[PDB]
């Protein structure tokens, strides 16, 4: 409690200070982290799946802290988009103008922070028109982020498949694996590292409603399902360490953090294995 | 065990002395103990540590040192021949034979490991026992010997807290 | 799921007809747990008289194994091929209950089989009846059993079930207690690290404040 109760406490003094300082005007590579709430993630997924193979989109509410964009809520714009293109001609704008006021009435103090949009079957990336719209929104509403969610890929793969991106300003002059995953404008935007967070009461009711999948965890047995992922993390971490030592002549801190995360997940798997062995193999001789 | 406390007692006896030199019996006992534990470096350093006058005064120190040289060169058959050359004091009469037994076991290891086939004469010289120990190889231990060639064939014979400590160290 | 239909028509018969019905039950494929039938008063009353041999045979088929029908083979009525095969299957089930990797030598000795091929054929035909599920490892001469049906339990070894489940519950309680202790220790370590970090921060800002004179 208390410390984990943070991020939901919204203050206006800090928001005004960071919005008046405008530190992103100097450093274009400012925002690197996107902290999305569980409610926003769930609403985004359900809205994206509701449109089927037609593209749907909406707004976001949230704030900025340092170099991180915090998403606390999601919208649902009344847009009737085609199977590959959403427009938001005239009803979406009035709807999002009215929804902010209606939320102000009930107590939602978060302002608009970006837009989320569905890519039904073509991954998560920013196309030419997505890049143009996001860069316009950044040029006139400086704190902004464009999130793209694939509903069909999420349902097929069984994992949440979405990304957060921010465009570079026009004129930003500064390999082959970034051309099929992204578009031809892949150098006009960058991907923020996306992390998800939940609250104390949300996790309380989630663990309370966790009563059918205990068998799944008692025999989950990682270090075999995530063996390929772990070795991928390791051989990326080796290159990160090489970059850090080249810098040595803070990248080293980030490499150490990644190594700690990978090692901690491995030891978590080993702890699960040890607990299972104690539970099932040390009984009846 | 009691051996640890006995070694502690010898450490206490060596720690303080009237002039840094202790009685010849305790020096001989310490040298014999050093030979027993295969700590030959401290054994030879103790041997040179003894003053020359007291060293030449008594021949028991000479016999203990000759045993030390015999075991230093790893001359196994001669260890038993030299250990039987002299008679030790009564207070160390039963323990020194025990030392012999220890060397016995040592030789056994050196035959069980590092020897696929060993000549019977060399095996008997290493273990010291003339012919009878060979029998103990087959009937009791379980080896398989054959005659007319004298070729002995030896045969080669609380956690969750730790992981929590590891994760706690790594996460902070 | 076939013993009940025999019990329904076995509730009134007694005497030679009852023993014939018992033999038919032991002969009928798919019946491997003769416990409910053994509880009937008609079957239990067979101890007194000349029909005690059939009650002994039923007890052997319910709790005993094939070697038990070695010393007293002649005393009990001669068993047909189907009854002998069923008894061998029950012996395999009993062996699999206590060990999940049964050596071929144990099976050959207990089932009195002189050929490995016929023993493997018997094990295969026992796998077909679905009483046991497993695989045969010829290289290691082993039978690995993943699952086996629960044979009949008499009213003298239920304490074994109670003891095993009590040991399982004790192990679960110990694991939960250890997990709680480790969680407490990890939280204490995290709080100590955070307290030390904040104390160092407070000291450095204090020294920075007094250094600005």
Coordinates of C-alpha atoms in Angstrom, one line a residue, chain A residues 125-280:
Chain A
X125 CA 3.4 0.1 -37.0
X126 CA 2.8 3.6 -38.4
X127 CA 2.0 3.9 -42.1
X128 CA 2.5 7.1 -44.1
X129 CA -0.9 8.6 -43.0
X130 CA -0.4 7.4 -39.4
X131 CA 3.0 9.1 -39.4
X132 CA 1.6 12.3 -40.8
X133 CA -1.3 12.5 -38.4
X134 CA 0.9 11.6 -35.4
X135 CA 3.5 14.2 -36.3
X136 CA 0.8 16.9 -36.8
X137 CA -0.6 16.0 -33.4
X138 CA 2.8 16.2 -31.9
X139 CA 3.6 19.5 -33.6
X140 CA 0.5 21.1 -32.3
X141 CA -0.2 19.0 -29.1
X142 CA 3.4 18.3 -28.0
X143 CA 2.8 15.5 -25.4
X144 CA 1.3 12.8 -27.6
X145 CA 1.7 9.1 -28.5
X146 CA 0.2 6.9 -31.2
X147 CA -0.8 3.4 -30.1
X148 CA -1.6 0.7 -32.7
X149 CA -3.3 -2.6 -31.7
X150 CA -3.8 -5.7 -33.9
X151 CA -7.0 -7.5 -32.9
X152 CA -6.8 -10.5 -35.2
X153 CA -3.1 -11.2 -34.4
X154 CA -3.8 -10.8 -30.7
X155 CA -6.7 -13.3 -30.9
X156 CA -4.8 -15.8 -33.1
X157 CA -1.5 -15.7 -31.1
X158 CA -3.2 -15.6 -27.7
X159 CA -1.0 -12.6 -26.6
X160 CA -1.6 -8.9 -26.5
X161 CA -0.1 -7.4 -29.6
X162 CA 0.1 -3.6 -29.5
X163 CA 2.7 -0.9 -29.7
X164 CA 3.3 2.8 -28.9
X165 CA 5.1 5.1 -31.3
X166 CA 6.2 8.7 -31.5
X167 CA 7.2 10.4 -34.7
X168 CA 10.3 12.5 -35.3
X169 CA 9.8 16.1 -36.4
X170 CA 10.2 16.9 -40.1
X171 CA 13.8 17.3 -41.1
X172 CA 15.3 15.0 -38.5
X173 CA 18.2 13.7 -40.5
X174 CA 19.8 11.4 -37.9
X175 CA 19.4 -2.3 -40.8
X176 CA 17.4 -4.7 -43.1
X177 CA 15.3 -6.1 -40.2
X178 CA 13.3 -2.9 -39.8
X179 CA 11.7 -2.8 -43.3
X180 CA 9.4 -5.8 -43.2
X181 CA 8.2 -5.3 -39.6
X182 CA 7.5 -1.6 -40.2
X183 CA 6.7 0.6 -43.2
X184 CA 8.8 2.6 -45.6
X185 CA 8.6 5.5 -43.1
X186 CA 10.2 3.4 -40.4
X187 CA 12.9 6.1 -39.9
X188 CA 10.3 8.8 -39.3
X189 CA 9.2 7.4 -35.9
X190 CA 10.4 5.4 -33.0
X191 CA 8.8 2.8 -30.7
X192 CA 8.5 3.5 -27.0
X193 CA 9.1 0.6 -24.6
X194 CA 5.6 -0.5 -23.6
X195 CA 4.9 -1.7 -20.0
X196 CA 1.6 -2.4 -18.3
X197 CA 0.5 -1.6 -14.7
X198 CA -2.4 -2.4 -12.5
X199 CA -3.7 -1.2 -9.1
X200 CA -4.0 -2.7 -5.7
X201 CA -7.8 -3.3 -5.9
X202 CA -7.6 -4.5 -9.5
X203 CA -5.0 -7.2 -8.5
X204 CA -7.0 -8.0 -5.4
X205 CA -10.1 -8.9 -7.4
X206 CA -8.0 -10.5 -10.1
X207 CA -6.4 -12.9 -7.6
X208 CA -9.8 -13.4 -6.0
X209 CA -11.2 -14.5 -9.3
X210 CA -8.2 -16.8 -9.9
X211 CA -9.7 -20.2 -8.9
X212 CA -9.6 -22.4 -12.1
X213 CA -6.0 -22.0 -13.3
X214 CA -4.1 -23.3 -10.3
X215 CA -3.4 -26.5 -12.2
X216 CA -1.9 -24.5 -15.0
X217 CA 0.6 -22.8 -12.7
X218 CA 1.3 -26.0 -10.7
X219 CA 2.6 -27.5 -13.9
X220 CA 3.5 -24.4 -15.9
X221 CA 7.2 -25.3 -15.7
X222 CA 9.0 -22.4 -17.4
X223 CA 12.7 -22.6 -18.4
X224 CA 11.3 -24.9 -21.1
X225 CA 8.5 -22.9 -22.6
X226 CA 10.6 -19.7 -22.4
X227 CA 14.0 -21.3 -23.2
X228 CA 14.2 -19.8 -26.6
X229 CA 13.0 -16.4 -25.3
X230 CA 15.6 -16.6 -22.5
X231 CA 18.5 -17.4 -24.9
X232 CA 17.3 -14.6 -27.2
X233 CA 17.4 -12.2 -24.2
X234 CA 20.9 -13.5 -23.4
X235 CA 22.4 -13.1 -26.8
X236 CA 20.9 -9.6 -27.0
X237 CA 22.4 -8.8 -23.6
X238 CA 25.8 -9.9 -24.8
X239 CA 25.6 -7.3 -27.6
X240 CA 24.3 -4.7 -25.1
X241 CA 27.3 -5.4 -22.8
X242 CA 29.6 -5.1 -25.9
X243 CA 28.1 -1.6 -26.5
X244 CA 28.5 -0.7 -22.9
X245 CA 32.1 -1.7 -22.8
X246 CA 32.7 0.2 -26.0
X247 CA 31.2 3.3 -24.3
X248 CA 33.5 2.6 -21.3
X249 CA 36.6 3.2 -23.5
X250 CA 24.6 5.0 -18.9
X251 CA 24.5 2.0 -21.2
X252 CA 26.1 -0.3 -18.6
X253 CA 23.3 0.4 -16.1
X254 CA 20.7 -0.6 -18.7
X255 CA 22.6 -3.7 -19.7
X256 CA 22.9 -4.6 -16.0
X257 CA 19.1 -4.1 -15.6
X258 CA 18.4 -6.4 -18.5
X259 CA 20.7 -9.0 -17.2
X260 CA 19.1 -8.8 -13.8
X261 CA 15.6 -9.2 -15.3
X262 CA 16.6 -12.2 -17.4
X263 CA 18.4 -13.8 -14.4
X264 CA 15.5 -13.1 -12.1
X265 CA 13.0 -14.7 -14.4
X266 CA 15.3 -17.8 -14.7
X267 CA 15.6 -18.1 -10.9
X268 CA 11.8 -17.7 -10.7
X269 CA 11.4 -20.7 -13.0
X270 CA 13.9 -22.6 -10.8
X271 CA 11.9 -21.6 -7.7
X272 CA 8.8 -22.9 -9.3
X273 CA 10.6 -26.2 -10.2
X274 CA 11.9 -26.5 -6.6
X275 CA 8.4 -25.9 -5.1
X276 CA 6.9 -28.4 -7.4
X277 CA 9.5 -31.0 -6.5
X278 CA 8.9 -30.4 -2.8
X279 CA 5.1 -30.6 -3.3
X280 CA 4.9 -33.7 -5.5

